[PDB]
Design a protein around this ligand. Structure first.
Ligand SMILES: C[C@@H](Nc1ncnc2ccc(-c3cnc(Cl)c(NS(C)(=O)=O)c3)cc12)c1ccccc1
Length: 828
C-alpha cells in the first residue's frame, strides 16, 4: 500500500490516465478487464528468455531481395569489429551465425552496433538481421563493438419475451426545435431492430417515460449487440451513446442507467461505436433508461458464387448474394477469401442461425490449414464483425506472425481495438503478449497506446487498461526508459506551446523569440532533464544533451521547434547530431498512419525484388495535437531549390534541380546514383500518393536529400487537379517538353511494376485504407472510402491497369506548372 500507490502514480504518469478512477464507468468491465489481464501478462512474462528479451535482436526470416543480393561479391561481408580503438575488419558469409563469428574471432587472431542499443545475438544467420540489411541497402559498412551482454535482472518485474427499454427522458443542462430519441439494436454495423419515440419540444428536460418494445426476442440477442441511443432534432443527429445489451459476464443488462452522451460535429467513425460514456457530465447531454427484462451444386450457381467470392472488400452484398453464400456455406468454407462475405451473410438476430454459424466455426480445417492472408485476416477485425468467435479466428492467424511483421501491422492492429465490442478481447491480449515478448514491439505499443489515450475520450479508458497491463510486465529497465522519455516530452511540450503564444501567427520569428527559446533550453538541462533519453520513433538511438546553438524555432505559422541532440552513446561512430522536430498544430495520428502504409508498400515491393526508395521518416504522436518528427539530414524542399535561383516569384524553372544535384554530388559517379535514386524515389512517391489520393501537393511539401532521395512530408495538411506531382523540373532530371528519354523510360517501367505489384494486394490496401479512415480520419463517407478501388482499377485486367497509370502520367505533363502555380497562388 505504501509503495503500491507510489507505483500506481508511476503507472499513471506514464499512461496519462488514472485507471483506478471510477468516476466515468457504470459497470465492472474496465476493472474486470484489468483483473483478467494478469494471467496473460504473467504467462508471457514467465515465458520470456531473459537474455534474448534484454537484447531484443531485430531479425527477419524473409529472403534477401534480388536487388540487395547483387551487392555482394563472394559471400563477403566486412564487419568492422571495435574494442576501445583497436578496429579490426573480418570477412564473414551470409550464413554465419553471430556466435560463430565470435568463435572465429578469438580463433583467428556479444556484438553490438556502434552508437545504438541494437545487438546481433541469438541463433540467427547474419543476413537475417535488419540492421545488416539496412547497411547493405544504403551501401554502408557494418561497425560493431564487442561488449558484455546487459544484465537480465534489470528487467525485473514487481426468454421468449421481446426486448423492451424504458426511455425516461433526456437532460441537456443548457440549450445555448423539437427532439426525438432513436434506439437501435446493432450488431457490427447492421441494425437488427429499430424503434423511435414521439417528438417533444426541446427543453433542458424532456421526459417521455415510454416503453420501446422491439420485435426481436431476448433469446435472439447475440453477444456484442449494442443498444445505440440517438437524439435527433427537427432532421439531424445531435447526440449518441451505446450500451452493451449483453454484459461481459454474458448477463443481460438491466437496471437504471443515466448515460452521458457524445456530441456530433457536422459517417463511418469508430468513435461512434464506443461503449464509453462522455466524462464531461457538467456540459454534456444525458439520457435516462430502464431495463426491466431478465448435395451437389449447379455449375451456373457455382460461378455466381465464385463471382461473389472473387469481388473486392468494399463491393456490397445484395440479399440475393447473401442467401446464396449462406445456403452454400459449407462450400464457401473451402475458400478462405469467402469468410468475410460469408459471416456477413449471417442473420445475427436469430439464435438458430448463430448456432449453425458456430457449427460452421467448429469445422475449420481449411481456414487453419490456409496460409496467412493479413488482408483477409484484417477484414474480420473491422467494424463489420462484432462476433467474439468470428474475430477470434482472425487473431488465430495473427499468432503465426513473426515480430518483423507484427511491427509492420502494429499501428493498424492497435487501432482495430476500437472495433472490438468488449474491453477484454483476443486482439487486446494478442498485443499485450507480443509487446511483452519483444521490447521493440513493446516500445511502439506504449506510444501508440499513449497516443490514443492522450487524445481519445471515446477509447482512452480501454487503451489505458491495456497500457497499464503492458507496463506492469515490461520490466523495471523499460519503466525507467519510458519515464525518462515521457519527462523529456512533457518538458519540451511546455516550451513549444509557450513559445507559440509569444508571437502572432502572421508575424515571423524575431529577436524576441530566438532569445526566449534558447533561454528556456538552458534552464531545462541543468534542472531535471535526464542525461539520455531513448528516441521514441527510433528506440535504438539514445539522445544526449541539446546542442543549444543549433536549436531554433521554425518560420512557420505552427512555430514548431527544430531541436538537435548529441548522441548519448560514446561509441557512436560520428558526431552528426540527432535532429528532432517538436510540433503542436497538426494531428500526427493521421501522418503516422500514412507513413505506416508507406512502409507496408515498401514491404510489398520487397516481395517482388523492388526498391522504390521512400523515406517514411520517424513520426510519433505523443499527446494532444503534439508530437515529434525525425529530421532527415541534408534535406531541403523543392520550393527552396526553386527559391535558391529565382526567388519568391513563381515563374518555375526546369533545370534548377539538376544543378542542385550536380552541385551537391562530388563525383560524377555519385551524380549518376543521385539521379538513379531520384528516379526511383519519385516513382515510388508517384504510385503511393496516387493510390492513397494525396498526390496533388504543394512542392514545399515535397523534400529531397542531397543524395537524390525525394520524399513527401506533412500529410496533416491535405487530410485544377492532377493525379500526382511530376513537375517539369523532375522530368528534366529524367532528361525531358513532351518527349521520351533513357531515364524517363525506366521511370515508366518502375512505375508500372510498382502499380501492378500493389494491385496484387488490392484487398489488403483497400482494407487498410478503409480502416485508416474509420479509426484515423474524422474528416468519413462511403465515397471517401470507395475512392481507392477506382485508383487500384478493381475489375480491370493487367493491361488496362498498366495503361490507366500511363494516362495519369500524361495528365501531369499536360498540366506542367499549371496546378503547382495555382498552389503558389494560394498565398492570398
Ligand atoms: C521542413 C523543414 N525541414 C525538414 N528537414 C529534414 N527532415 C524533415 C523531416 C520531416 C519534416 C516534416 C514532416 N511532417 C511534418 Cl507535418 C512537418 N511539419 S512542420 C513543417 O515542421 O511544421 C515537417 C520536415 C523536415 C525545412 C525547413 C526549412 C527549409 C526547408 C525545410
Amino acid at each position: 500500500s505504501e509503495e503500491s500507490q507510489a507505483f500506481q502514480r508511476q503507472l499513471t504518469a506514464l499512461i496519462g490516465y488514472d485507471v483506478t478512477d471510477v468516476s466515468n464507468v457504470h459497470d465492472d468491465e474496465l476493472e474486470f478487464t484489468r483483473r483478467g489481464l494478469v494471467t496473460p501478462r504473467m504467462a508471457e512474462v514467465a515465458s520470456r528468455d531473459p537474455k534474448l528479451y534484454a537484447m531484443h535482436p531485430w531479425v527477419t526470416s524473409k529472403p534477401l531481395p534480388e536487388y540487395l543480393w547483387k551487392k555482394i561479391a563472394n559471400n563477403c561481408i566486412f564487419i568492422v569489429i571495435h574494442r576501445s580503438t583497436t578496429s579490426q575488419t573480418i570477412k564473414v558469409s551470409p550464413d554465419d551465425t553471430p556466435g560463430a563469428i565470435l568463435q572465429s574471432f578469438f580463433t583467428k587472431m556479444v556484438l553490438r552496433v556502434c552508437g545504438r542499443d541494437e545487438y546481433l545475438v541469438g541463433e540467427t544467420p547474419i543476413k537475417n538481421f535488419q540492421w545488416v540489411r539496412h547497411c547493405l541497402k544504403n551501401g554502408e559498412e557494418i561497425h560493431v563493438v564487442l561488449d558484455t551482454p546487459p544484465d537480465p535482472a534489470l528487467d525485473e518485474v514487481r426468454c421468449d419475451r421481446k426486448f423492451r427499454v424504458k426511455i425516461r427522458g433526456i437532460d441537456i443542462p443548457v440549450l445555448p426545435l423539437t427532439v426525438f430519441v432513436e434506439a437501435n439494436i446493432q450488431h457490427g454495423q447492421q441494425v437488427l431492430c429499430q424503434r423511435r419515440t414521439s417528438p417533444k419540444p426541446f427543453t433542458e428536460e424532456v421526459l417521455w417515460n415510454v416503453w420501446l418494445e422491439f420485435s426481436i426476442k431476448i433469446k435472439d440477442l447475440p453477444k456484442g449487440a449494442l443498444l445505440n441511443l440517438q437524439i435527433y432534432c427537427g432532421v439531424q443527429l445531435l447526440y449518441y451513446v451505446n450500451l452493451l445489451l449483453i454484459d461481459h459476464r454474458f448477463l443481460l443488462r438491466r437496471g437504471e442507467y443515466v448515460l452521458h452522451m457524445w456530441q456530433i460535429s457536422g459517417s463511418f467513425n469508430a468513435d461512434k461505436l464506443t461503449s464509453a460514456t462522455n466524462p464531461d457530465k457538467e456540459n454534456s447531454m444525458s439520457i435516462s433508461i430502464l431495463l426491466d427484462n431478465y448435395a451437389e451444386m449447379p455449375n451456373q450457381l457455382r460461378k455466381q458464387l465464385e463471382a461473389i467470392i472473387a469481388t473486392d472488400p468494399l463491393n456490397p452484398l445484395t440479399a440475393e448474394d447473401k442467401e446464396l453464400l449462406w445456403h452454400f456455406r459449407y462450400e464457401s468454407l473451402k475458400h478462405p477469401k469467402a469468410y468475410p462475405k460469408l459471416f456477413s451473410s449471417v442473420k445475427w438476430g436469430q439464435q438458430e442461425i448463430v448456432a449453425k454459424t458456430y457449427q460452421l466455426l467448429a469445422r475449420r480445417e481449411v481456414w487453419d490449414q490456409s496460409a496467412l492472408d493479413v488482408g483477409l485476416t484484417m477484414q474480420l477485425l473491422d467494424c463489420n464483425f462484432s462476433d467474439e468467435n468470428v474475430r477470434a479466428i482472425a487473431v488465430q492467424k495473427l499468432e503465426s506472425l513473426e515480430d518483423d511483421d507484427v511491427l509492420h501491422y502494429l499501428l493498424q492492429l492497435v487501432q482495430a481495438v476500437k472495433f472490438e465490442p468488449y474491453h477484454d478481447s483476443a486482439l487486446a491480449r494478442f498485443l499485450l503478449k507480443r509487446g511483452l515478448r519483444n521490447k521493440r514491439i513493446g516500445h511502439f505499443l506504449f506510444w501508440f497506446l499513449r497516443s490514443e489515450i492522450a487524445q481519445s475520450r471515446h477509447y482512452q479508458q480501454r487503451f489505458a487498461v491495456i497500457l497499464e497491463a503492458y507496463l506492469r510486465g515490461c520490466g523495471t529497465a523499460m519503466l525507467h526508459d519510458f519515464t525518462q522519455q515521457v519527462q523529456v516530452i512533457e518538458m519540451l511540450q511546455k516550451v513549444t506551446l509557450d513559445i507559440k503564444s509569444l508571437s502572432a501567427e502572421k508575424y515571423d520569428v524575431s529577436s524576441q523569440v530566438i532569445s526566449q527559446l534558447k533561454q528556456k533550453l538552458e534552464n531545462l538541462q541543468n534542472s531535471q532533464l535526464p542525461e539520455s533519453f531513448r528516441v521514441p520513433y527510433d528506440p535504438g538511438l539514445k539522445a544526449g544533451a541539446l546542442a543549444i546553438e543549433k536549436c531554433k524555432v521554425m518560420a512557420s505559422k505552427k512555430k514548431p521547434l527544430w531541436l538537435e541532440f548529441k548522441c548519448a552513446d560514446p561509441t557512436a561512430l560520428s558526431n552528426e547530431t540527432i535532429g528532432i522536430i517538436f510540433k503542436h498544430g497538426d494531428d500526427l495520428r493521421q501522418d503516422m498512419l500514412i507513413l505506416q502504409i508507406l512502409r507496408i508498400m515498401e514491404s510489398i515491393w520487397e516481395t517482388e525484388s523492388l526498391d522504390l526508395c521512400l523515406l517514411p521518416y520517424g513520426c510519433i504522436s505523443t499527446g494532444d495535437k503534439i508530437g515529434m518528427i525525425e529530421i532527415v539530414k541534408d534535406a531541403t524542399t523543392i520550393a527552396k531549390i526553386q527559391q535558391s535561383t529565382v526567388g519568391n516569384t513563381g515563374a518555375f524553372k526546369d533545370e534548377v534541380l539538376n544543378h542542385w544535384l550536380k552541385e551537391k554530388s562530388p563525383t560524377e559517379e555519385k551524380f549518376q546514383a543521385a539521379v538513379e535514386r531520384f528516379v526511383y524515389s519519385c516513382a515510388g512517391y508517384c504510385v503511393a500518393t496516387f493510390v492513397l489520393g494525396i498526390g496533388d501537393r504543394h512542392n514545399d511539401n515535397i523534400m529531397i536529400t542531397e543524395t537524390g532521395n525525394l520524399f513527401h512530408i506533412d500529410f496533416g495538411h491535405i487530410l485544377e487537379r492532377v493525379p500526382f506531382v511530376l513537375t517539369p523540373d523532375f522530368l528534366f532530371v529524367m532528361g525531358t517538353g513532351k518527349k521520351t528519354s533513357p531515364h524517363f523510360q525506366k521511370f515508366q517501367d518502375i512505375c508500372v511494376k510498382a502499380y501492378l505489384a500493389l494491385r496484387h494486394h488490392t484487398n489488403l490496401l483497400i482494407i487498410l485504407f478503409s480502416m485508416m479512415l474509420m479509426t484515423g480520419m474524422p474528416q468519413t463517407s462511403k465515397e471517401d472510402i470507395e475512392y481507392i478501388r477506382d485508383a487500384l482499377t478493381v475489375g480491370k485486367n493487367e493491361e488496362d491497369a498498366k495503361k490507366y497509370f500511363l494516362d495519369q502520367i500524361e495528365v501531369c505533363r499536360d498540366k506542367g506548372w499549371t496546378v503547382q502555380f495555382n498552389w503558389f497562388l494560394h498565398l492570398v
